Paper text:
The overall fold of PfoI monomer represents a typical PD…D/ExK nuclease fold with the structural core made of central four-stranded β-sheet surrounded by α-helices (50–52). The PfoI monomer is composed of an N-terminal α-helical subdomain (residues 1-131, colored pink-yellow and blue-green in Figure 1B and C) and the C-terminal subdomain (residues 132–312) that bears PD…D/ExK core (colored orange and cyan in Figure 1B and C). Structures and mutagenesis indicate that PfoI features a permuted E…ExD…K active site that differs from the consensus motif characteristic to other family members.
We solved the crystal structure of apo-PfoI at 2.6 Å resolution. Interestingly, the apo-PfoI crystals grow only in the presence of the specific oligoduplex that was not present in the crystal. In the crystal only one protein chain is present in the asymmetric unit; the dimer is obtained by applying crystallographic symmetry. The dimer interface as calculated by PISA extends over ∼1890 Å2. Residues 239–249 are disordered in the apo-PfoI structure.
Residue numbers in the entry:
A (entry chain A), B (entry chain A): 1 to 239, 246 to 312
Amino acid sequence: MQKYRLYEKDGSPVQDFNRFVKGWLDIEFGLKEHQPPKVFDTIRDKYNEAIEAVVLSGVAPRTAHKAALSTLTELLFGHDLAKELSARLDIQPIGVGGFRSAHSQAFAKNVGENFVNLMVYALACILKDNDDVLVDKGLPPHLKKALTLSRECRIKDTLREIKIPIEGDLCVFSRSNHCNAIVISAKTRLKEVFHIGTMWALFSDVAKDEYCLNKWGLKVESSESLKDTMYVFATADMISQGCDVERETPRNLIAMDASFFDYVFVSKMGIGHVSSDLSLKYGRESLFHELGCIIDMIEQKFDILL
Amino acid sequence: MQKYRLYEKDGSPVQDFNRFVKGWLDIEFGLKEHQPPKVFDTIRDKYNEAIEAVVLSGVAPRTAHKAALSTLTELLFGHDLAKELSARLDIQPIGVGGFRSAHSQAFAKNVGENFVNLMVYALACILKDNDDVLVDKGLPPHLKKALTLSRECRIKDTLREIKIPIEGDLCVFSRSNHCNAIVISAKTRLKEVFHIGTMWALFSDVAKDEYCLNKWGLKVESSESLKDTMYVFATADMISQGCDVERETPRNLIAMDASFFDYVFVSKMGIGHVSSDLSLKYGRESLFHELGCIIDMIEQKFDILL
């Protein structure tokens, strides 16, 4: 299998970036920076078949991807996504199928990574004709080092340099500025693990504030650069006591976790408290947005049209 | 079963506090603020039998409790604690026994709460003749409200007041000042859940800093009062890939989590990087201290002798 590289040895992203990314998830070729996706073939095709079905019904491609993103939880459950998108967009009642492979152990053991893969693919598809705004699973080299804090802690006699690598599952960033990015953390569920994200959500705030850098004795490569670095969370709310996002009002601890993120997206639609509108100008509408609103977020932030 | 109350209706702790606490764990009587301990009877007796055995060997009571605290992980595994304390203190090789009940499902389902119970009991025993410095499972009412942050977040039309209750599993506090306390978070293991503690460890810092209060739009009852509020973590390192604390050098993410706590105690002894000395005057010796050092921490902080 032929393998290419997304980034040059300096860290610069190769031209027509979103092409190599989409090809990697299409398994048209492997990549240097990434291992081939696992049991992603079926759900990737089921996604595209839904987009093809909706688009051929006069619906704009942007409208399709944005609607599919806000309904990815269905595709992850192996349900007929196109039957879902059609009902919402009120076009001709479509059937693409759904897939038994969803109920397999291999799929259930890779659903977490496939959720990340679905978002990367959906974004790569809509950004395929754009080489200014890029998308990649995980963080680009330059941003991963910029989001890495440092700390020196006393271990008896000697001193231990401690690294604080603020994580991200996927990233939408600018070619001319890798810090001008949207870092996305993704989990299929929230539960109490959401607190872990809040810690990272706080550190991303901390890394931008020279006062906070000093209070906790932290060293960052450049705090001013991270000014344009947005830090968000994306969840499928896949779920017992029920769900965490899909309810009349989210629980207090869940609400507080989402509040310290810049934005929190969910791949569900029709939830009362969840905002379907996203305007960077007028501020965060609610604690939870529909995942499709990330398109609007990308458009406004990077000043492009999809 | 007769039930008493640790706190009056105003919030003031009843006189001879540590007596009612020790009695509750002795199940001499129930309490209003606490439900009776579960499957704690066996391990509580096995603890005392070890202290009785060591003390009757000329060893001072303070020396016993401090050594037992730094070896609680053994008592939680159902091992012969007195055979362990004797070997360390180099007195007459003792046998108290150990207990089969450790390998029971009921004990395994309550080991997490019993770990908290063991620490509360051990501290209650050593503080039984002190009515100035108190110990209680969880936080006292006045401190629980003082450690509760507040935040207003926009939910579309309306505004949602969000509570941020900085948690604690047990607390050692002053009667004349409940904020002058040692808040202790306790888990039998660290793993990735330790990040959750780091979030709380950060919020405790945040709650003390009027700048940080304002940056994140947070309201606290009194930030100045929490100045004397110490926030620590206690773990049994009970453990595969091995342990997290019991190794030559703890993993990076584990180290960074411990670093944002004021102190981190472990109920193990003989670990190279773990400090057996604790001096508030000369600062935190290492990221991990022996749990027995919390006695020294209590003594120095509250200016008492045990």
